């Protein structure tokens, strides 16, 4: 009957749909590889989808996926076993090298622009008409690392203008240079800003930005990467 028809029909629809859904999520990081980077033998039942090309705003060109994949940065890792499936140990300083939970991707060295073509993110000093409207203004508060030692002082807030959002705290270190600190990895308190991931001694290692009034996708990744990695790698210095 009709009902039987409809339901049998639907289970068929649903199956080609999953198939669709699945092949679309195969647009990045495919095809699969062996730990040595050579193409892996068994890529699953699903074919790579036919490529699609994105036209990036503000004349930044195009992106076609799937496409040639490459890390475009050295990886300082060495195998710890003779068969597949085991960890790869950092061969240096994982933090300094950017592997592990400290990994960063070779994104572009161009900042994200808003709908109009201006830099999406800005130090608040250069963002005409922006003020802390609620909560504790961090600016001026010392910054404490997981080792409970003071590392610097907030000397500005880098805001996201289109979303009127605090993205990073800029921090002034003992030598007078500054670093960005992701907003998402610090606790703003009444008399201090506490950073659990980094011990005071690692703030200097936080990668620097080439221009003082801009951050690029590449530098966001290298920073967030680094600060995140502290959680696993600063661990010996963290006390509470």
């Amino acid at each position: 009957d009709l009902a039987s028809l409809a339901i049998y029909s639907f289970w068929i629809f649903l199956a080609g749909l999953i198939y669709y859904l699945q092949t679309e999520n195969m647009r990045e990081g495919y095809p699969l590889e062996n730990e040595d980077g050579t193409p892996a033998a068994n890529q699953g039942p699903f074919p790579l989808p036919k490529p699609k090309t994105f036209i990036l705003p503000h004349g930044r060109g195009t992106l076609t996926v799937p496409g040639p994949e490459s890390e475009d940065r050295p990886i300082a890792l060495a195998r710890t076993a003779v068969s597949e499936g085991f960890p790869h140990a950092p061969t240096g300083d994982p933090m300094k090298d950017g592997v592990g939970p400290a990994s960063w991707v070779a994104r572009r060295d161009l900042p994200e622009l808003d709908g109009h073509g201006h830099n999406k993110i800005k130090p608040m000093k250069a963002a005409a008409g922006f003020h802390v409207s609620a909560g504790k203004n961090p600016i001026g508060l010392p910054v404490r690392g997981c080792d409970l030692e003071i590392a610097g002082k907030v000397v500005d807030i880098w805001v996201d203008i289109p979303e009127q959002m605090a993205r990073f705290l800029e921090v002034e270190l003992k030598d007078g240079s500054t670093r960005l600190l992701p907003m998402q990895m610090v606790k703003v308190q009444s008399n201090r800003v506490h950073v659990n991931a980094l011990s005071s001694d690692l703030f200097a290692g936080i990668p620097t930005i080439k221009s003082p009034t801009e951050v690029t996708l590449l530098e966001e990744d290298k920073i967030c990467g680094y600060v995140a990695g502290g959680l696993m790698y600063a661990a010996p210095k963290r006390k509470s």
């Binding site: 495919y30 990036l56 890792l77 790869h88 709908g115 979303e163 959002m165």
Partner: protein, 281 residues
Amino acid sequence: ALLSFERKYRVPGGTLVGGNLFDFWVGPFYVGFFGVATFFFAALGIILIAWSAVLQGTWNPQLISVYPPALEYGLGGAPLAKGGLWQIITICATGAFVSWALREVEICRKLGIGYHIPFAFAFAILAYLTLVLFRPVMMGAWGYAFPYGIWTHLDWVSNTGYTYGNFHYNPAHMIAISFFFTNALALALHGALVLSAANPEKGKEMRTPDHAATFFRDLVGYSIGTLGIHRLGLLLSLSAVFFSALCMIITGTIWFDQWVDWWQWWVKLPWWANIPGGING
């Protein structure tokens, strides 16, 4: 075996239990100590379930059903064929679930991300525990739990419901449903919003978030924002399930009568209780 960008992430560490012992992968999958735990609990449980199936004398999945002990057994142990098997199976499920959560924690650490996912999952686990542990205890027999079978479980739902009248009147049930509906609404929108920006009209450039933000202000005069809608989603979801637990944990424990009748409180407020006319006067 690895995604084109996976290797630099596959470093040692992050394990909660047992150091480097189980710190490794099997194909795409991460094992970890709890990798093993869940496997063991999952193996055992499925076994017991098959064992129930022979005692039942059917291999047909639409028929197979593992029932809790009958009320006469209260919160004591029961013979295998008479409810023990379900009790173990329930222990094993719990073991599986919790372990699966703790593995999520272990992966979280290795990758250096937040614990929001293990977190949210614990709500699912807590809803399940409400229906097979917290409610039966409080009620006083494993027998109030739902049976493990594809349709028999739908039956428990239907019977348990109709016991208190039309269950629609359970007030926390009303609230729990509003989230389920609301969440789906919001998942519908979020998905649609991002896709429409990433896949504009033919030949146009990728829209920007500002476009997205704009699209909604134009539509319903307000845009909650990208950190927003994601905070929203997590919340509606967790809330739906939170109220779902609540509506059950109260049902049969502190309220055992017809749910519709509980509304008489409102209608019988002394200031309008006796005023004639309307529906109730």
